[PDB]
Design a protein around this ligand. Structure first.
Ligand SMILES: Cc1cc2nc3c(=O)[nH]c(=O)nc-3n(C[C@H](O)[C@H](O)[C@H](O)COP(=O)(O)O)c2cc1C
Ligand SMILES: Cc1cc2nc3c(=O)[nH]c(=O)nc-3n(C[C@H](O)[C@H](O)[C@H](O)COP(=O)(O)O)c2cc1C
Lengths: 167, 167
């Protein structure tokens, strides 16, 4: 299983949630706050950058992917969308994918979730029904972890994902 | 009026569409294929960057914005979304905005437009009802211009935008 943190901010909540999942379920982790890619430009030179080549290899190799992203302006991060722009159905086709969005509060998160789902379908990925929105109340920044109130939801998310990866 | 080209590819169709509009209507132009920003990372140092400050001022002073983007995996480009992530409602609130998507295939464009409208709403922009989709048939790459069949469509889009800007 592969977990991708979609927040470019080293101090972002989404990064906390991503780390929690990867550690707990012994999964692979791509952290976009550390995995700095250039802005896609369609030039062939970019397809020979180690990081881009690595992104393709690890996504193709994952039997299942948990896609995390903060909600920036009612959409997924440009950081994550930029990363996906390097990729195609070549890596995502029939790929079991689970969606999680981290919002600033209220009714945020849905737009980002749908954005990710739409884009995942654009590359012919299999996005499981269960999707999750995390709010600031679900994140513990000082202790660098998620709150107890959301741990059950995340487990349900991962379990549905890995179960669908087998099926 | 400000025209923003959302395609990072110097050889992109969207860039040709954006240049046609900017030249014809004597508008300000931001071209993401030449206007390369860093991947947003939420760090204060980035706000000092000249291009970031320029991006904010130019969008702020614009009486109206023509937002173009290619459909990348059923969404706006990562380059465009990344640029928008540097911005907020402070620059976009009540800003008259027209949406134009450039798809590569028959029934493409709708998903990008949804994504764009949703995002523009997220920053409280005033998106006009009329939106437009350009196909490869509407772009003459060889002559670096748009086909005659679409010139009237583009014209009417700009005109509705000006009208909103005046209101
Ligand atoms: C550029 C930017 C745009 C944001 N837009 C939204 C938004 O549209 N809706 C929302 O609920 N929160 C928004 N937020 C707040 C984020 O949800 C908040 O930072 C949250 O912790 C997830 O982002 P993070 O992983 O970077 O921490 C935005 C934050 C930034 C930096
Ligand atoms: C990364 C990437 C993803 C694309 N995905 C789509 C797609 O989702 N739907 C579509 O109609 N065209 C898609 N295309 C084709 C573009 O629409 C085509 O390149 C078009 O000319 C607009 O992009 P451009 O401005 O870079 O030329 C994609 C192109 C790229 C580079």
């Amino acid at each position: 299983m592969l977990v991708i943190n979609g927040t470019p901010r080293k101090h972002g909540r989404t990064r906390i949630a991503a780390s929690y999942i990867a550690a707990l379920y012994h999964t692979d982790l791509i952290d976009l706050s550390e995995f700095v890619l250039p802005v896609f430009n369609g030039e062939a030179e970019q397809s020979e950058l180690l990081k881009v080549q690595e992104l393709k290899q690890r996504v193709t190799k994952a039997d299942a992917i948990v896609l995390l992203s903060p909600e920036y302006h009612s959409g997924m991060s440009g950081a994550l969308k930029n990363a996906l722009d390097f990729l195609s159905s070549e890596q995502f086709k029939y790929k079991p994918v689970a969606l999680l969005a981290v919002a600033g509060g209220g009714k945020g998160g849905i737009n980002a979730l749908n954005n990710m789902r739409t884009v995942m379908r654009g590359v012919y990925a299999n996005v499981i029904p269960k999707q999750l929105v995390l709010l600031p109340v679900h994140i513990d920044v000082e202790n660098a972890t998620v709150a107890e109130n959301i741990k059950e939801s995340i487990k349900e998310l991962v379990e549905e994902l890995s179960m669908f990866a087998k099926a």
